[PDB]
Design a protein around this ligand. Structure first.
Ligand SMILES: [Cl-]
Ligand SMILES: [Cl-]
Lengths: 63, 65, 64, 64, 65, 63
């Protein structure tokens, strides 16, 4: 499963995830479309999802 | 503190660091100019420098404390 | 200490040298057990060691 | 070169390998003359060689 | 110069050095942390490293020049 | 014979040995009681005794 989708699963919605991270919903869409969450947002997603997804899942090329 | 410079000095030269990472010297020079190594190269740098620099020193905006 | 040994000291560890060459640590260990590095790795060793360990020291039979 | 020979190269000498295994140098020499190491020494050889010389290479009849 | 690190690198890893001396890895890590191998292990280290380090390098306060 | 006792034989007294080494008489007693001269004092004892006892006699586990 895609790591972003896991994060959406945990937050319950695109708007809730976006608000949780302080980013635009368009950002989350762009991340899903490009197949890349920004490296600098990985810890924040690991945090807001309470560990449902971790950094190495989001960006194995970085972590 | 300039983590990129510590890394260059650990290997001994920009050439040696570039070689150790499989990149062009110009890439290292660019990272240094902009003060930012690519996130996906931080572990590699930590490894080739034998831990003389660590990921959090290279990209504190990416790695945890 | 032989050429491999000093290449390792230069990089600081087997881990660091393996990473610098794009090989597994186990490959370095195998080279040490054989007593020599593959010819095809010598150029890269010379580069990543900042010239401290040169091709002709690694493989005199190849590089003279 | 066989497994014993490369274990010796890895450690650097018969002295160094004997010391690393807690055996007399004469024991190493005896193993070489027999053509194989005792099964009970294979785990330690694998360890002290940093994995370069593994049990199954030393004693295929035991370790496969 | 760090004689303990030269010894670790000669064997290839802390595990291999520990094995060669019949000690726990934690012992090697402790020696390194405190910058001092036990006097009674110096000859053993000199032997297992095939002389890549010698007793006087390990414990200059114990061995002669 | 005990190596420390040989050293005392050579220096002539506990105080002379202690002074020769720059240590407390209590140190020499402790060394005798514990059955261990400090490794870092072996060369000094070999020196002050002019070779009457040598390092390998004092600490065969070290030398
Ligand atoms: Cl032999
Ligand atoms: Cl190794």
């Amino acid at each position: 499963m895609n790591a972003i989708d896991i994060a959406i699963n945990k937050l319950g919605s695109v708007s809730a995830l976006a608000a949780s991270l302080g980013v635009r919903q368009s950002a989350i869409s762009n991340w899903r479309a490009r197949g890349r969450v920004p490296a600098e947002r990985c810890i924040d997603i690991e945090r807001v999802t309470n560990g449902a997804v971790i950094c190495r899942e989001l960006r194995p090329d970085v972590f």
